[PDB]
Design a protein around this ligand. Structure first.
Ligand code: S7J
Ligand code: S7J
Length: 284
């Protein structure tokens, strides 16, 4: 029975190595990683790989690993796939902990934009969770944290993290993580998966996929939203992605909205993440 070595980048930036039989389905690897992480609320997570065009794809747990990674390395990342709209309702603190690690990367990477004060407040909860109570001995007037808090660090930001950290004395790690999440969950781009696309006139837009539905970012002054209930059908054909928007009351027919994706693979990838979000957030 021939086994393939798998390398998974965990949310703390460390590398897990394991072996699975070469015909293994994605679920096999995912279960091994989740057992390693002592994670029971696994439904919010998945594994990504980089395809032959270097795009992030979700590993499908139902299909063979080899048929997905194809010509590429058996190299994966462990990630949040479905961001809970209300992290307080997760049953385990360790679930909320991995969600925090994902969100810290979402912030540092610039995928999750965040005001100065929110960057500093989220930072202060991370520091409280990781180091415990503010200690002046570790922090002088010229202190810079090892912690990455933002896509661009300033001395003013480092100072504001410390000032807010002082306010958190006696806060336990689970408590600081819950405050981190109570704040992060409100950010306009929280759990929004962005896809570059063109509308039916060739104007460049972004499509966001999330718990509440499909978002269409045109300009700052033109953002369209389709709640999952208002979507009847999700389809792709060639480089095109279509959604069937349900008839309004007393309207005779469904409306159809058409988008152009960069290539056929980009169209299918958007279709699959949409169907998966629809199913997940229909049931949750
Ligand atoms: N959310 C899930 O339960 C889930 C399971 N398994 C996988 C895998 F194996 F493809 F990575 N991705 C997601
Ligand atoms: N833009 C927001 O929804 C938002 C979230 N969280 C905060 C925090 F941390 F300062 F309280 N400020 C703003």
């Amino acid at each position: 029975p021939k086994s393939m070595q798998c390398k998974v980048i965990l949310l703390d930036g460390s590398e897990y190595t394991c072996d699975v039989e070469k015909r293994s389905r994605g679920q096999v690897l995912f279960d091994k990683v989740c057992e390693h992480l002592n994670l029971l609320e696994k439904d919010y997570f998945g594994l990504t790989y980089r395809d032959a065009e270097n795009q992030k794809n979700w590993l499908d747990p139902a299909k063979e690993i080899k048929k997905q990674v194809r010509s590429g390395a058996w190299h994966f990342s462990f990630n949040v796939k479905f961001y809970p709209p209300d992290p307080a309702q997760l049953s385990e603190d360790i679930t909320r902990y991995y969600l925090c690690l994902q969100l810290r990367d979402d912030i540092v990477s610039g995928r999750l934009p965040c005001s100065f004060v929110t960057l500093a407040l989220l930072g202060s909860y991370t520091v409280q969770s990781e180091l415990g109570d503010y200690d002046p001995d570790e922090c002088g007037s010229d202190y810079i944290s090892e912690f990455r808090f933002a896509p661009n660090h300033t001395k003013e930001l480092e100072d504001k993290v410390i000032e807010l950290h002082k306010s958190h004395r006696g806060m336990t790690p689970a408590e600081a993580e819950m405050h981190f999440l109570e704040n992060a969950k409100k950010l306009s781009m929280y759990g929004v998966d962005l896809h570059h696309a063109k509308d039916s006139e060739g104007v460049e837009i972004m499509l966001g996929v999330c718990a509440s539905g499909l978002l269409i970012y045109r300009d700052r002054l033109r953002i369209n939203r389709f709640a999952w209930p208002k979507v009847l059908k999700i389809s792709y054909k060639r480089n095109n992605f279509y959604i069937k928007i349900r008839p309004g009351e007393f309207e005779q027919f469904e409306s159809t909205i058409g988008f152009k994706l960069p290539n056929h693979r980009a169209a299918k990838r958007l279709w699959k993440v949409c169907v998966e979000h629809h199913t997940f957030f229909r049931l949750l």
